[PDB]
Write a protein that binds this DNA or RNA. Structure first.
Ligand SMILES: *P(=O)(O)OC[C@@H]1CC[C@H](n2ccc(N)nc2=O)O1
Ligand SMILES: *O[C@H]1CCO[C@@H]1COP(*)(=O)O
Ligand SMILES: [Ca+2]
Ligand SMILES: [Ca+2]
Length: 903
DNA sequence: ACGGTAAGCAGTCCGCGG
DNA sequence: GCGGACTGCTTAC
């Protein structure tokens, strides 16, 4: 096994590094690192080193890191470039590890913890930590154990020991239903006072110190709470022992009337799961409680308990510890599914950065390009300052809102990284500029070729074709990796189901799994000898091809993530390599590209069909276009169309054998027109959509920009046995529209696309009649609640207050007094409802925290003055009206043909 | 501090008004 | 008094 780093930090002139060594042991070393930076120099005095612009550079070596920083400061105050890596950690890692780091994650301590704090007044603020910590569960990946510390005596009660035996037992008999596979894994530890508990915990931490610290909301609550709790009782020095180097920073807080803040524990790497999830789920949640994320991710229910949680330790201690145990486990279950931690680790070791820097695409990419440039003795630019000037982006086809019966979309492959490569965009490849004509003029091939010699973008930028550019080179390196490991992940399943069918063959002679690598596709040398194997080494030949299928997935996905994260880096002013003109160059080119192929598609289908200037491209957004395929269908007619599968075949055959070639011909001209280095605009078909054959369904409708629905039968050649609704943007896609309403509109949209107007009407008629029976939560609205405390004027609202904040502050005024009632948290979400006329509240609406049931004390009331008539019209009818107006349908008989006008 | 474009909504504004 | 414009905040592609 080879060496790799665990964590790294700069403290003064020292780098403090934790690492795994030659033999698998973790260690700490302090290195009084001597860094290098670079300055320009005469031609003559040329070295081995050059900047990316190809300019000769003198290497300066510094006694310490402070001296380096003092030099950058001196060079600034002069006005000369100070080149090289100014994050000396990235330089430390780059020097210490010149090679593909290969981590073994079983050697990395990843801690998973949660704490409980009984608090009879407010939510317990972690910056004051004024209430005792009465339970901690701490799971340790090296040990594979849940370490439970349980306070038995506290100001808020004395309670007997938790029992594991009772905890393992079922729901229906006073048991907790702590799952069977972890029960044998819990190390229970009771305490008669809080100082003893905290002291033992600090000791534990000393000997089992996390490299990677995770959990749920652990960064904004748990870590600062224990830190501050310990600090408040023991002193700063004691609480510093949470850091393996006894250094912490307490970062400048956000105050208005509360008081809250984040602690940095040097030498630990904190990935809060709530943050890994908000980064890597790409699905927006109505609430962000662990409670609500589990029922979503894992399909495990409520975490039941009679009575409020502040009386939970007192009333039911046994379930209290158990729930804190299940809390830790539930993260661990999500990470088994999601593999977010391993993703982060895989990213961070590829880039050679602190694992916690995966939350930054700028730092990840900075590091990747730095390593790549170093290994060729090149020198990175001084990261300069730039004014946050807004450039223009992807303009969007404004669609005629309407029904659209037959639709097939096509998609540009990784548009933006493809553009950088094709045009060869990079700081140092800028060649000059040209007279730019209006964009329509390029899109239309009217303006003259921008250049015979350089590679151009319609914003005016020219680039060298003869170089090939720091940035394009780097993306290309990653694309080819993303295709390398795709042959080692989709080949790790070729090794699985081929050992999965050899499992028929059992055992009669002792064996051990064969020594040939999984990063290759097997042949015939071991073909009849994976058969004559035993059925115990067949189980071990399934540990490994499954552990490349995951690593090959996790690594490649990390490349896909790397590829799409770049543009964001490139357009961001803090990026070493940003350049406004290049960014604009990228977008402006995309926009051209997308409208170019628009005109190319419309030109083509008009010649094929025998027709002049009729629109086929009904919409376009950034990388896709959506073509109306009605006239393609109607050029054969419903007939000799056997069944639904028959016309979809037709459209699949048509796009692949005819359209796609013309698109290709179209983009090649565009390449020649702009004289790009390389043609990389690869547009092939995405979705095929329409109504079931022989039906009254409408297949699709657009409402406006970014708001549409399609009945899809095929996605990239994967034909569905049942049609999939591709709704993009409508209320059923929104986190703020109620659930029961999210359902109804989906069923409405389904009925429109697949069945009659008759069936839409039958359903609308019924959802109305059954509305009052619905669950008050399933029919409540949702919004983020930002700046509550701006419109908050003596309990009431002042000038310009939103609806959602109105609700927040008629709540604040209803619960004024009752402490065991949740107070809306600013930045978090709120569930909203409307109240009617002479209500006992004061204003029109009421909003309470999302995820939750409203305090018992007003829940019964709010189920009397609830405005369902306004709530039905607001959340259901208004949006339905939108769809049907667009689709040219009615949801109700008797509807007038006039209106939809103005007279 | 670690990309633009655009929706739909509820509040208010603005100019034009017996 | 009137209704379209513009603002402010969400949350979408
Ligand atoms: P839509 O009709 O699904 O098309 C999606 C396109 C792709 C780029 C652009 N987009 C989507 C999502 C985010 N977050 N940012 C974007 O620019 O819309
Ligand atoms: O514009 C920002 C937000 C999304 O892309 C960039 C990310 O840069 P940073 O490294 O978070
Ligand atoms: Ca798309
Ligand atoms: Ca594709």
């Amino acid at each position: 096994m080879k060496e790799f780093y665990l964590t790294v930090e700069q403290i003064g002139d020292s780098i403090f590094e934790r690492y795994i060594d030659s033999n698998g042991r973790e260690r700490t070393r302090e290195v009084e690192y001597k860094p290098s930076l670079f300055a320009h120099c005469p031609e003559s005095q040329a070295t081995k080193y050059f900047d990316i612009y190809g300019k000769p550079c003198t290497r300066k070596l510094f006694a310490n890191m402070r001296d380096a920083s003092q030099w950058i400061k001196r060079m600034e105050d002069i006005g000369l470039e100070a080149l090289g890596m100014d994050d000396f950690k990235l330089a430390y890692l780059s020097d210490t590890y010149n090679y593909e780091i290969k981590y073994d994650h079983t050697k990395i301590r990843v801690a998973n913890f949660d704490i409980e704090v009984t608090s009879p007044d407010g939510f317990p603020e972690p910056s004051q930590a004024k209430h005792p910590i009465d339970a901690i569960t701490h799971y340790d990946s090296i040990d594979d154990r849940f370490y439970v510390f349980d306070l038995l005596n506290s100001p808020y009660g004395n309670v007997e020991e938790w029992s594991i035996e009772i905890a393992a037992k079922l729901q229906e008999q006073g048991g907790d239903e702590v799952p069977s596979e972890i029960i044998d894994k819990i190390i229970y530890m009771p305490f008669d006072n809080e100082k003893e508990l905290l002291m033992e915990y600090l000791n534990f931490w000393q000997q089992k110190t996390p490299v990677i610290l995770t959990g749920w909301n652990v960064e904004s609550f748990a870590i600062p709470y224990v830190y501050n709790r310990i600090k408040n009782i023991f002193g700063e020095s004691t609480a510093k022992r949470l850091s393996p180097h006894r250094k912490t920073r307490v970062k400048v807080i956000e105050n208005m009337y509360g008081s809250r803040e984040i602690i940095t524990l040097f030498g630990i790497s904190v990935l809060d799961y709530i943050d890994l999830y908000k980064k890597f789920s790409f699905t927006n949640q109505p609430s962000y409680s662990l409670d609500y994320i589990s029922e979503f991710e894992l399909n495990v229910g409520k975490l039941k308990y009679d009575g409020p949680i502040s009386k939970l330790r007192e009333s039911n201690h046994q379930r209290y510890i158990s729930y804190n145990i299940i809390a830790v486990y539930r993260v661990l279950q999500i990470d088994a599914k999601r593999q977010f931690i391993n993703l982060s680790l895989d990213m961070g070791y590829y880039a050679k950065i602190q694992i916690q820097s995966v939350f930054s695409p700028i730092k990840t990419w900075d590091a990747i390009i730095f390593n790549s440039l170093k290994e060729q003795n090149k020198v990175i630019p001084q990261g300069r300052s730039h004014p946050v000037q807004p450039y223009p982006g992807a303009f969007v086809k404004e669609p005629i809102p309407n029904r659209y019966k037959y639709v097939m979309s096509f998609d540009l492959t990784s548009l933006y990284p493809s553009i950088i490569r094709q045009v060869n965009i990079s700081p140092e490849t800028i060649a000059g500029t040209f007279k730019v004509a209006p964009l329509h003029d390029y899109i239309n091939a009217v303006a003259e070729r921008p250049s015979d010699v350089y590679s151009c973008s319609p914003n005016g930028m020219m680039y060298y074709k003869d170089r090939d550019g720091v940035v394009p080179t780097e993306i290309t390196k990653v694309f080819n990796q993303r295709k390398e490991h795709k042959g080692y992940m989709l080949a790790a399943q070729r090794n699985g189901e081929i050992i999965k069918e050899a499992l028929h063959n059992p055992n009669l002679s002792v064996d051990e799994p064969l020594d040939v690598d999984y990063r290759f596709d097997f042949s015939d040398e071991i073909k009849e000898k994976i058969k004559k194997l035993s059925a115990k080494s067949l189980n071990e030949m399934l540990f490994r091809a499954q552990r490349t299928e995951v690593a090959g997935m996790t690594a490649q996905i990390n490349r896909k993530l790397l590829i799409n994260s770049l543009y964001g880096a490139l357009g961001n002013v803090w990026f070493r390599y940003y350049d406004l003109r290049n960014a604009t160059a990228i977008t402006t080119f995309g926009q051209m590209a997308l409208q170019w192929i628009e005109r190319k598609v419309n030109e083509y289908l008009n010649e094929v069909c025998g027709t002049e200037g009729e629109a086929f491209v009904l919409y376009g957004d950034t990388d896709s276009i959506y073509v109306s395929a009605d006239k393609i269908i109607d050029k054969v007619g419903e007939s000799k169309f056997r069944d639904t599968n028959h016309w979809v075949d037709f459209l699949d055959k048509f796009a692949r054998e005819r359209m796609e070639p013309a698109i290709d011909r179209g983009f090649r001209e565009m390449c020649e027109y702009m004289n790009n280095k390389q043609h990389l605009m690869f547009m092939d078909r995405e979705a095929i959509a329409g109504p079931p054959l022989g039906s009254k369904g409408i297949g699709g409708f657009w409402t406006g920009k970014k708001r549409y629905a399609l009945n899809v039968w095929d996605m990239e050649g994967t034909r569905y046995a049942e049609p999939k609704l591709k709704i993009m943007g409508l209320e059923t896609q929104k986190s703020s529209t109620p659930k029961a309403v999210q359902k109804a509109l989906k069923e409405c949209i389904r009925r429109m696309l697949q069945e009659g107007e008759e069936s839409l009407q039958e359903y609308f008629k019924e959802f109305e009649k059954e509305f009052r029976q619905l669950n008050y939560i399933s029919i409540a609205s949702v919004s983020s609640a930002n700046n509550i405390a701006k419109y908050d004027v003596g309990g009431f609202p002042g000038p310009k207050c939103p609806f959602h904040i109105r609700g927040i502050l008629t709540y604040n005024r209803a619960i004024k007094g009752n402490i065991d009632a949740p107070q809306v948290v600013e930045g978090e979400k709120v569930y909203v409802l409307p109240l009617r006329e002479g209500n006992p509240f004061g204003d029109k609406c009421i909003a309470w925290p999302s995820g939750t049931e409203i305090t018992d004390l007003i829940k019964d009331d709010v189920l009397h003055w609830m405005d369902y008539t306004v709530l039905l019209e607001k959340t259901f009818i208004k949006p339905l009206e939108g769809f049907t107006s667009a689709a040219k349908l009615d949801y109700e008989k008797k509807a007038s043909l006039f209106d939809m006008f103005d007279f």
